[PDB]
Design a protein around this motif. Structure first.
Motif, PDB file in Angstrom:
ATOM      1  N   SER A 118       0.714  -1.173   0.070  1.00 15.68           N
ATOM      2  CA  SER A 118       0.118  -0.011   0.018  1.00 15.68           C
ATOM      3  C   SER A 118       0.808   1.376   0.025  1.00 15.68           C
ATOM      4  O   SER A 118       2.045   1.420   0.562  1.00 15.68           O
ATOM      5  CB  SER A 118      -1.036   0.031   1.250  1.00 15.68           C
ATOM      6  OG  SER A 118      -1.481   1.368   1.438  1.00 15.68           O
ATOM      7  N   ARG A 146      -6.586   3.122   8.730  1.00 16.48           N
ATOM      8  CA  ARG A 146      -7.756   3.124   8.043  1.00 16.48           C
ATOM      9  C   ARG A 146      -8.816   1.955   8.455  1.00 16.48           C
ATOM     10  O   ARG A 146      -8.129   0.678   8.645  1.00 16.48           O
ATOM     11  CB  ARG A 146      -8.182   3.116   6.625  1.00 16.48           C
ATOM     12  CG  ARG A 146      -7.126   4.178   5.977  1.00 16.48           C
ATOM     13  CD  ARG A 146      -7.951   5.257   5.505  1.00 16.48           C
ATOM     14  NE  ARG A 146      -8.070   6.303   6.734  1.00 16.48           N
ATOM     15  CZ  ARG A 146      -7.649   7.454   6.830  1.00 16.48           C
ATOM     16  NH1 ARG A 146      -6.967   8.042   5.764  1.00 16.48           N
ATOM     17  NH2 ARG A 146      -7.938   7.911   7.628  1.00 16.48           N
ATOM     18  N   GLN A 193     -11.624  -0.347   8.326  1.00 15.92           N
ATOM     19  CA  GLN A 193     -11.898  -1.498   7.821  1.00 15.92           C
ATOM     20  C   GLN A 193     -10.794  -2.169   7.099  1.00 15.92           C
ATOM     21  O   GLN A 193     -10.605  -3.420   7.148  1.00 15.92           O
ATOM     22  CB  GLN A 193     -13.032  -1.333   6.785  1.00 15.92           C
ATOM     23  CG  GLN A 193     -14.324  -1.046   7.564  1.00 15.92           C
ATOM     24  CD  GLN A 193     -15.265  -0.630   6.502  1.00 15.92           C
ATOM     25  OE1 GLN A 193     -16.106  -1.281   5.688  1.00 15.92           O
ATOM     26  NE2 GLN A 193     -15.459   1.056   6.628  1.00 15.92           N
ATOM     27  N   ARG A 194      -9.988  -1.514   6.455  1.00 11.44           N
ATOM     28  CA  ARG A 194      -8.619  -1.932   5.857  1.00 11.44           C
ATOM     29  C   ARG A 194      -7.651  -2.295   6.630  1.00 11.44           C
ATOM     30  O   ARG A 194      -7.209  -3.648   6.378  1.00 11.44           O
ATOM     31  CB  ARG A 194      -8.280  -0.980   4.920  1.00 11.44           C
ATOM     32  CG  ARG A 194      -9.182  -0.901   3.555  1.00 11.44           C
ATOM     33  CD  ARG A 194      -8.852   0.082   2.849  1.00 11.44           C
ATOM     34  NE  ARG A 194      -9.157   1.345   3.339  1.00 11.44           N
ATOM     35  CZ  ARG A 194      -8.981   2.706   3.053  1.00 11.44           C
ATOM     36  NH1 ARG A 194      -8.096   2.813   1.934  1.00 11.44           N
ATOM     37  NH2 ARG A 194      -9.321   3.540   3.379  1.00 11.44           N
ATOM     38  N   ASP A 195      -7.327  -1.824   7.740  1.00 14.19           N
ATOM     39  CA  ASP A 195      -6.306  -2.077   8.476  1.00 14.19           C
ATOM     40  C   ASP A 195      -6.382  -3.127   9.558  1.00 14.19           C
ATOM     41  O   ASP A 195      -5.585  -3.718  10.003  1.00 14.19           O
ATOM     42  CB  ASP A 195      -5.394  -0.995   8.874  1.00 14.19           C
ATOM     43  CG  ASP A 195      -5.004  -0.318   7.553  1.00 14.19           C
ATOM     44  OD1 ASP A 195      -5.112  -0.598   6.750  1.00 14.19           O
ATOM     45  OD2 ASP A 195      -5.145   0.955   7.926  1.00 14.19           O
TER      46      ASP A 195
END
Length: 197
Positions: free
Chosen positions: A46, A68, A70-72
């Motif tokens: 990323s 972030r 949701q992503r992380d």
């Protein structure tokens, strides 16, 4: 020759969105081991992730910024290998929003400030943090952990939480962040610059 053994193991961490999280993993071996990172069995990719080596690859930091939610939020795995053996360890990352920030989550009350110091002289970068319970403080310079103990006494971390650097070399120059950690989570100070001379 010895198989790898961890000297730094990444802990589970709870961070704040828009913030920073660093995982540090370090191992010793002969031959020197290589550190490797996976998120859920996949090599990490990323604009928001960086891996920084130290100790000639025997040490590694995974830095995520900005966090972030949701992503992380995931499990991240460090692997240390040499010709003799492979070892691994994992850590969980949790990211909270504002809306979800528990009382007593740490706060940086007075962060460190730009400082310029003479080569001879001694510099101390200040972190005064708050929270319930009182957070432990650690420092990162240019994304890497600063380890006072490794310093042959030159660098010390005070009980105020400030970092005292004495006999300032040119290697002292760099952007310093202070992280305040407690059971609630982790908060980073803004970076502060130390220049020498």
């Amino acid at each position: 020759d010895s198989k790898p053994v961890f000297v730094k193991v990444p802990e589970d961490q709870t961070g704040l969105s828009g913030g920073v999280a660093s995982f540090v993993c370090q191992a010793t071996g002969e031959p020197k081991p290589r550190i490797t990172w996976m998120k859920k069995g996949k090599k990490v990719s990323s604009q928001r992730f960086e891996v920084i080596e130290f100790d000639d690859g025997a040490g590694s930091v995974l830095r995520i910024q900005p966090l972030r939610v949701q992503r992380d939020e995931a499990i991240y795995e460090c692997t240390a290998t040499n010709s003799l053996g492979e070892i691994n360890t994992s850590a969980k990352l949790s990211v909270l929003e504002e809306d979800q920030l528990p009382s007593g989550f740490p706060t940086i009350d007075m962060g460190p400030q730009l400082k310029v110091v003479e080569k001879g002289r001694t510099a101390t970068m200040l972190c005064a943090a708050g929270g319930n319970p009182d957070p432990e403080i650690s420092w990162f310079k240019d994304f890497l952990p600063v380890d006072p103990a490794a310093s042959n006494g030159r660098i010390k971390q005070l009980r105020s939480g400030a970092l005292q650097i004495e006999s300032s070399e040119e290697s002292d120059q760099g952007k310093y962040e202070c992280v305040a950690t407690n059971s609630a989570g982790t908060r980073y100070s803004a970076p502060a610059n130390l220049y020498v001379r």
